[PDB]
Structures are given as structure tokens and as C-alpha cells.
Amino acid sequence: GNRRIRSVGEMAENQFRVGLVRVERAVKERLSLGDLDTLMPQDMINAKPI
Amino acid sequence: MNLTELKNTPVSELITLGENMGLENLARMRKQDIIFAILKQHAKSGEDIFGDGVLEILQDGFGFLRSADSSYLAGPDDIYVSPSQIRRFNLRTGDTISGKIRPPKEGERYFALLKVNEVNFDKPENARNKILFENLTPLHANSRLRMERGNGSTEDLTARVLDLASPIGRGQRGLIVAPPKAGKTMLLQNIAQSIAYNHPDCVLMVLLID
Numbered sequence: 001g002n003r004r005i006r007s008v009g010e011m012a013e014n015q016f017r018v019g020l021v022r023v024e025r026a027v028k029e030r031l032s033l034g035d036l037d038t039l040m041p042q043d044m045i046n047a048k049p050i
Numbered sequence: 051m052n053l054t055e056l057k058n059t060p061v062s063e064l065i066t067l068g069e070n071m072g073l074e075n076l077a078r079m080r081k082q083d084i085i086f087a088i089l090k091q092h093a094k095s096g097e098d099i100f101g102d103g104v105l106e107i108l109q110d111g112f113g114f115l116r117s118a119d120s121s122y123l124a125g126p127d128d129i130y131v132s133p134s135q136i137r138r139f140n141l142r143t144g145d146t147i148s149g150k151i152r153p154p155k156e157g158e159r160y161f162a163l164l165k166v167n168e169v170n171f172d173k174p175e176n177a178r179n180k181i182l183f184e185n186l187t188p189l190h191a192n193s194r195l196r197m198e199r200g201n202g203s204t205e206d207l208t209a210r211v212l213d214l215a216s217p218i219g220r221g222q223r224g225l226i227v228a229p230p231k232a233g234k235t236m237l238l239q240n241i242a243q244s245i246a247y248n249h250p251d252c253v254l255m256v257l258l259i260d
């Protein structure tokens with residue numbers, strides 16, 4: 001009752017969030033320059049980290 | 051600042067401008083390097099840039115806005131634009147674009163366009179609604195391009211003679227068949243001067259190849 005079991009899905013989601021926090025920091029530091037009519041919501045996201 | 055006002059000035063003007071900007075001895079670099087350094091120094095004070103360049107695309111997808119200083123070649127003054135802008139504003143090669151640009155930001159090395167202002171001296175509205183070239187219908191010329199100046203100087207002969215030898219019309223397909231060292235250089239000089247005097251509305255273009 002005090003020991004919890006975690007499956008593959010839970011750790012996969014945890015690793016996804018660990019990568020997403022890095023991607024979020026990246027998109028935040030890149031959003032410091034982005035203005036209107038300058039970019040589509042595709043170039044600010046890289047596939048590398050996650 | 052505007053880029054064209056750095057375009058039309060000679061090298062000594064750039065020298066004194068850089069001396070005004072408190073820059074290192076810049077007599078060693080290319081004119082475009084001087085323009086790049088001056089634009090960087092100007093934007094370091096928190097300023098935006100205004101540029102004008104003819105657009106060119108490779109298979110790489112993104113576009114480059116070249117100036118007439120290097121006769122439309124790669125250089126530190128040309129502007130880099132993403133394929134997204136070409137997809138949005140319906141851009142293509144040869145489309146001269148003027149508007150706001152910024153110096154290369156952190157990690158960048160060429161200029162980037164911010165907001166388009168004049169697409170071929172036109173608003174993006176009718177620039178996006180552009181008729182295709184090859185989809186047009188060719189015709190023949192009724193508008194006669196008068197080559198006579200009317201002043202009647204010593205050289206104007208070479209122009210007025212065409213008025214009786216080879217009539218010139220708008221959209222004419224003309225070709226000169228001539229041996230070297232015969233007088234073609236001054237001939238085209240005369241024709242350019244005459245068309246500019248009699249018809250200043252049409253944009254003049256001269257091709258100096260090889």
C-alpha cells in the first residue's frame with residue numbers, strides 16, 4: 001500500500017516531460033525575439049531534444 | 051538608416067561615415083564590409099535598418115536579396131529570407147523587395163527581412179495578384195519609340211538615322227550583327243540616352259556581359 005508500481009507508459013511520459021522542459025526553455029528563449037508576421041509555429045521547435 | 055543611401059555613395063563617403071562611427075581603420079575592407087560594419091554600429095545604438103534587394107532562390111529553399119553594387123552576387127550586404135516569407139507573400143526570383151531589415155542576430159551572419167514595404171514598387175496586395183509571364187499573350191508594337199532627340203548635335207546622327215533605318219517599338223526583338231571595333235559601344239550609349247530623353251517613363255536596363 002505504500003509501494004507504487006509504474007509501468008512503461010509512466011516512465012515514457014516522464015522522459016517526454018523531461019525533454020519537453022528543455023524544448024520549452026528553448027522556445028521561450030527564442031520567443032524573446034519573435035514578433036508578428038515573422039515566423040510560422042514550426043521553426044521555433046526542434047526535434048533534437050525530445 | 052536606409053541601405054540605398056549607403057549604396058549611392060562612393061568609397062570615401064563610407065570612409066568618413068565609419069570615422070564618424072568611431073570605427074577602426076576601414077580602408078582595407080570591401081565596400082560591402084564597410085557597409086556591414088556601419089550598419090552593425092548603427093543598430094548597436096538600438097536602430098532598425100531599411101533595405102532593398104532583388105530576390106533570388108536556389109533549391110535550398112530560402113531566398114537572398116542582392117544589391118546592384120556587386121551586380122547581384124552573394125555578399126555581406128545581401129539579405130537572407132526564410133522560405134516561409136516566399137510562401138506567404140508569393141515571392142519569386144527577380145522580385146525586387148524593399149522594407150525593414152535587421153543586422154544578423156546571435157549566431158547569424160547575413161541580414162534578415164522583418165516587414166515587406168514595397169514589392170516591385172507596389173503594395174503586397176496587387177503584388178500577390180500578379181499575372182504570370184508565360185501565361186500572357188504576346189503582341190506586336192504600335193507604340194513607336196522615337197529615337198530622335200530634336201537637338202541635332204554632332205552625334206545625334208547615329209540616333210536619327212535609325213528613325214529611317216530601323217524603327218524601334220516597345221517589345222521589339224532586335225539583334226545587332228556587327229564586327230568588333232566598329233562603334234557598337236557608343237551606339238548603345240546613344241540609344242540609351244535617346245530613349246531616356248524621349249521616354250523617361252520606361253525603366254532603363256543595360257546588360258554589360260563579359
Ligand SMILES: Nc1ncnc2c1ncn2[C@@H]1O[C@H](COP(=O)(O)OP(=O)(O)O)[C@@H](O)[C@H]1O
Pocket residue numbers: 205208229230231232233234235236237
Ligand atoms: N559618332 C562618332 N563620332 C566620332 N568618332 C566616332 C563615332 N563613332 C565611333 N567613333 C570612333 O570609333 C571608335 C569606336 O571605338 P569602340 O568603342 O572600341 O568601337 P566598338 O563599339 O565597335 O568597340 C572610337 O575610337 C571613336 O573615335
Ligand code: BEF
Pocket residue numbers: 229230231232233234235
Ligand atoms: F567591338 Be569592340 F570589341 F567593343
Ligand SMILES: [Mg+2]
Pocket residue numbers: 231233234235236
Ligand atoms: Mg564596343
